[PDB]
RNA sequence: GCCAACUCAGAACUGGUACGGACAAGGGGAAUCCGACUGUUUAAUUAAAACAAAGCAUUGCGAUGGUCCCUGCGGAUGUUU
RNA sequence: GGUAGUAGCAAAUAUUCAAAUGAGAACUUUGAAGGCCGAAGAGGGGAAAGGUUCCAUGUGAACGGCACUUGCACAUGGGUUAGUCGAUCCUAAGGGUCGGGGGAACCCCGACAGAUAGCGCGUUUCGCGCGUACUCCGAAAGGGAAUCGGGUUAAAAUUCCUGAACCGGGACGUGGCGGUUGACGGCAACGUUAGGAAGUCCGGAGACGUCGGCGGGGGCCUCGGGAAGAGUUAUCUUUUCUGUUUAACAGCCUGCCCACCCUGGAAACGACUCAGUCGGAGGUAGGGUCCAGCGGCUGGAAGAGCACCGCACGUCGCGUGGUGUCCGGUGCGCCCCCGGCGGCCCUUGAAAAUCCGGAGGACCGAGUGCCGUCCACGCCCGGUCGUACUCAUAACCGCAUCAGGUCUCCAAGGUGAACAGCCUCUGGUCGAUGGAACAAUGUAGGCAAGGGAAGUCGGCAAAAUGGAUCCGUAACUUCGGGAAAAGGAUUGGCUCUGAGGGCUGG
RNA sequence: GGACCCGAAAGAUGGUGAACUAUGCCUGAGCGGGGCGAAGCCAGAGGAAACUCUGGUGGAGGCCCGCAGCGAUACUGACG
């Protein structure tokens, strides 16, 4: 099979990790499509929750 | 398929009539005893053997053997 | 020169009704000895929705008279009836909503519902949601009990015509606003192909006496006879007055 | 990223036509028919399930595929009529019939003083 | 926070058909989705189900009723004036 | 102690101020006329202010009936009121 | 005939090198390179429609709008295997009818004007009891009895081969089970492979809309470790790539979210979801029952498949042997199925065949054999027709190998909110007659100093704006909007800092 | 009278088409990713009270941008 390297998919992935290509001009979607408050507001709930009991 | 569970069972089933043949597999950790009839195929996995010798040895005379 | 709309109304086939999701007639028990002269006890099972239809349907099942086997029936809901009431029909039934009693049993002043015509017709008037018909006077010597109509009409029947105690269920329907056309395309899809309509006066000559002109008028009297023939007959049939009170 | 083709002639996504995807033993992905989802039996005065039956199709109910300890319940209207139900049948049989050995000793009652 | 100042429930037709006819469907709006006292069990739990049928979720039972409300005006009226007539009657 | 994810917010340093680096992706404002709006329309010159629409009003009719189809017999509305 | 060897052959990025065959090669085949389709495909299948176009061999002429050694053309042969996939069965909208009513009649209405088909029990084949005028057609997407791996052809396969199952029907034999004539256990939910029964009656399943959140399962995607092979290696790289599999069916276990049962009796109210909601009509709590599973283990089953490493014939052994197929993580991820809530309706979102269960108990048997038995095992049978192939930028329609039209299933990686655009992997493909030049005029796509609509009927066309984050936003208004109004600032790379979790252990 | 030959727009009679298109009915199938943020619910603040306010949760709409699908405004573009 022809080769197709995932090594820079890793590589990026590590970075992002480390907190780089995460600026105002990497950013296309909005806050929420990136990741909804509402996910948020359940993980949330669910740890405080768990605490709780 | 189904599996039997004890020698005697499985003896009391090879003894019967439909009892066409008897297979008997050699695992690393096991043998295995396959009995053909006519609805179902039985199989008795013995984890020693020399059970599994003895067995063998007990098989009926009429009933053909085949070794893998 | 072509058949108007009104008139291919007649010939049906994409103007026959729908009733693929109806649940069968409503109507009272065939009236047989036991209504005629005592009561039967029935128990309502189910109040349903019919489609096309305003007023709850309620499923009651009674027993036989003379035979081993539950006898089923289709009754037009009147308001306050539940699951597991008892219905009482019969001469000597008591009155309470629900009940269905000869009008010779039901006492002047009284609010009733799904009024036979025809003694042991079933059922024939008052049986939309929020309609009723009221019970104004008796005349024993010919037997003939008088009603008022939700239309206001008074009516004689026979005294032995039947008809449920209380109103229909279901009333107040036609106060709220539908506020957009597909409100109305669903209430008609399952009623008939009436809906949208198409005024007169936006058609050709060719399919409709309003149509034509080069601006939109009638330009006749919309009045038309009560002999008119068909294709003719459009507008305000018969009218013998128009325009505001 | 093996993609799949339907097994039979039915080339639509109908209700009867659901599968499931399958690993076999040659390393290959295969769909598999699965039968619809059907709901078990229903107690009709309670509308809940009844308890102690599987929920499948009604053929798949037939004697001769399935034991009858499996579509039998061991009580009065067993898979028919929920435990609940059947308790408020026999206390109301029990008391309509008590009630109604009242109401005939009072009118014998009642006609002995008269 | 007061997310509307008077629009309540209609504010889902936004500014559609007219404040009129908004204002006047707001009365049916809230009370065929409003919960009714159940008679038979005691409970604030009597939902619509279809137009004239309202059901019960703690106790099941299903009356016939009003299209946008458990019991209309005159359905008091009618039990009234059948109660005089069958009292009249039995007297 | 052992694992786990990409979201967010800040601070330095740094490049010829380049950086949503391709791709992707509203021009905006002040008024008049018409139609309320969504919807529909002249397949192959007109998509519109035309049609429909919810809302408003009028007319007939209680079944031996109103409207309509049919040579006739009988039918649609009507599983209706 | 002139027109005239003229108009034309131009959409869908693209071909090149070497060799083979052949009289003849830009166009056939092999290899190599460079590109495209880019998973809502130019890939892999179906429905309709077509009808041999499917596969092998060969080829004068015609045809394949240049050409051909070639082929969806021509000629000669071959090819479609079913108890389990469908039709077949059921009924839907409806269609066709008896009788009756009309009609000159062809025909019209259609169970509406009427001594219905028949169905069960025991039998001297006769008697008894029920019997509401169609037991007809109508779905290769509705409902519905039953099959799975592995292998195999030039062309067929869930149909052929092997192995292993299942469904329907028939008849008996053996063993087992009950007789307190019709089982046992549990307080209960209910459990156990068996464990009476006729007319009659009753319930359920089949059986159902749409939208939103959440949760569970299978497949895919993805990260790490072990081992096998391959790629790179001027330099670095314990790194890059590929694969590391387990079908129907039988048994046992488990027991999601719900539902249900027993103990007990609650305000200082508690429990609880993302959202709700629940509780003296019995909550929390403790202990149980049942329900789903595309869940786990075992048999099937490693003997199979796959990868790797060897020996041998070396023209025809479909030959012969070994090693491995292992252990974990992660998730608002993607496709499918399921569970349970909530929103919506003047809309409430089929029927029947068929199957299961239940109410009743007429009737029925014996003492070492009788009467029953939905239990286990054993025995026999299973018709007819379709099945090749295309499903489309040449296999259907459009007079054609026409850039049009024609229902549907599967769906990888990167960037990115994204089945947007762009690139890539599997698979496919370079098929649009070729060569030389780079005039005018065109078609399609750009740029242009200074001015900026003076052009024009008219800003037609083009340009300008555009994603995301932060600040900020007027008149008017049906108070819902206007609104992304308007108007401003920022955006890369690199190196860090802080915040936001799970499991285990008193 | 066919009436030297050829020629109408029409009229009548009897049959055939809803494989395109129009409408009703039955039974199936299909429709990314984002924006706004109505009911209902939780908590907090102000106030003498009435009551008001704030921050969250949720996900309504013949709502908005927009992919597929469906359609067809302008170039009065190409072709003609
Ligand atoms: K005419
Ligand atoms: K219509
Ligand atoms: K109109
Ligand atoms: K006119
Ligand atoms: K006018
Ligand atoms: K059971
Ligand atoms: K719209
Ligand atoms: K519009
Ligand atoms: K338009
Ligand atoms: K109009
Ligand atoms: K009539
Ligand atoms: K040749
Ligand atoms: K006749
Ligand atoms: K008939
Ligand atoms: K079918
Ligand atoms: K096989
Ligand atoms: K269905
Ligand atoms: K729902
Ligand atoms: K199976
Ligand atoms: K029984
Ligand atoms: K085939
Ligand atoms: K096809
Ligand atoms: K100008
Ligand atoms: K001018
Ligand atoms: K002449
Ligand atoms: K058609
Ligand atoms: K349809
Ligand atoms: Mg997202
Ligand atoms: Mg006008
Ligand atoms: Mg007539
Ligand atoms: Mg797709
Ligand atoms: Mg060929
Ligand atoms: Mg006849
Ligand atoms: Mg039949
Ligand atoms: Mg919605
Ligand atoms: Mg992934
Ligand atoms: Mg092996
Ligand atoms: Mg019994
Ligand atoms: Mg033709
Ligand atoms: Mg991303
Ligand atoms: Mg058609
Ligand atoms: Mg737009
Ligand atoms: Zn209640």
Not at chain 1, 2 to 26: L, T, V
Not at chain 3, 228 to 241: C, E
Not at chain 5, 58 to 83: E, P, Q
Request: charged share 30%; hydrophobic share 30%; net charge positive.
């Amino acid at each position: 099979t022809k080769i197709h390297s995932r090594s820079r998919a890793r590589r990026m992935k590590e970075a992002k990790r480390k907190g780089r290509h995460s600026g105002y001009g990497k950013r296309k979607g909005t806050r929420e499509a990136r990741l909804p408050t509402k996910v948020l507001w359940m993980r949330r709930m669910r740890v405080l929750r768990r605490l709780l009991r | 398929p189904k599996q039997i569970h004890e020698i005697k069972d499985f003896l009391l089933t090879a003894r019967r009539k439909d009892a066409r043949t008897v297979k008997i597999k050699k695992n690393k950790d096991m043998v295995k005893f396959k009995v053909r009839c006519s609805k179902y195929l039985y199989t008795l996995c013995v984890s020693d053997f020399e059970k599994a010798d003895k067995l063998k040895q007990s098989l009926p005379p009429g009933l053909s053997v085949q070794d893998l | 020169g072509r058949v108007i709309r009104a008139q291919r109304k007649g010939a049906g086939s994409v103007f026959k009704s729908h009733t693929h999701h109806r649940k069968g007639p409503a109507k009272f028990r065939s009236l047989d000895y036991g209504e005629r002269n005592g009561y039967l006890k029935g128990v309502v099972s189910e109040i349903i929705h019919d489609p096309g239809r305003g007023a709850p349907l309620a499923r009651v099942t009674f027993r036989h008279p003379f035979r081993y086997k539950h006898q089923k029936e289709l009754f037009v809901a009147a308001e306050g009836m539940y699951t597991g009431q008892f219905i009482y029909c019969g001469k000597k039934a008591n009155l309470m909503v629900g009940n269905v009693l000869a009008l010779r049993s039901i006492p002047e002043g009284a609010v009733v519902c799904n009024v036979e015509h025809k003694v042991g017709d079933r059922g024939v008037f008052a049986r939309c949601s929020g309609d009723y018909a009221i019970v104004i006077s008796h005349n024993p010597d010919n037997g003939t009990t008088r009603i008022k109509l939700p239309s206001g009409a008074k009516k004689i029947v026979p005294s032995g015509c039947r008809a449920m105690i209380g109103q229909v269920a279901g009333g107040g329907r036609t106060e709220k606003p539908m506020l957009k056309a597909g409100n109305a395309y669903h209430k008609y899809r399952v009623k008939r192909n009436c809906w949208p309509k198409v005024r007169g006066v936006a058609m050709n000559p060719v399919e409709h006496p309003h149509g034509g002109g080069n601006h939109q008028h009638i330009g006749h009297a919309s009045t038309v006879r009560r002999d008119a023939p068909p294709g003719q007959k459009v507008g305000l049939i018969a009218a013998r007055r128009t325009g505001r009170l | 990223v093996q993609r799949l083709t339907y097994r039979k002639r039915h080339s639509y996504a109908t209700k009867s036509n659901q599968h499931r995807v399958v690993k076999t033993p040659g390393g290959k992905l295969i769909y598999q028919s699965t039968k619809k989802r059907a709901s078990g039996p229903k107690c009709p005065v309670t509308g809940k399930r009844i308890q102690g039956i599987p929920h499948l199709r009604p053929t798949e109910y037939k004697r001769s595929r399935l034991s009858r300890n499996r579509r039998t319940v061991n009580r009065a209207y067993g898979g028919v009529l929920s435990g609940s139900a059947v308790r408020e049948r026999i206390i109301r049989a029990f008391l309509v019939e008590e009630q109604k050995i009242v109401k005939k000793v009072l009118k014998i009652q009642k006609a002995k003083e008269k | 926070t007061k997310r509307t100042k008077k629009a309540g429930i209609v504010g889902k037709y936004g500014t559609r058909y007219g404040a009129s006819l908004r204002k006047q469907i707001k009365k049916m709006e809230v009370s065929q989705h409003s919960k009714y006292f159940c008679e038979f069990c005691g409970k604030y739990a009597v939902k619509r189900k279809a137009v004239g049928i309202w059901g019960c979720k703690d106790c099941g039972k299903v009356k016939a009723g009003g299209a946008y409300t458990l019991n209309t005006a005159s359905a008091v009226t009618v039990r009234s004036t059948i109660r005089r007539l069958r009292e009249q009657t039995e007297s």
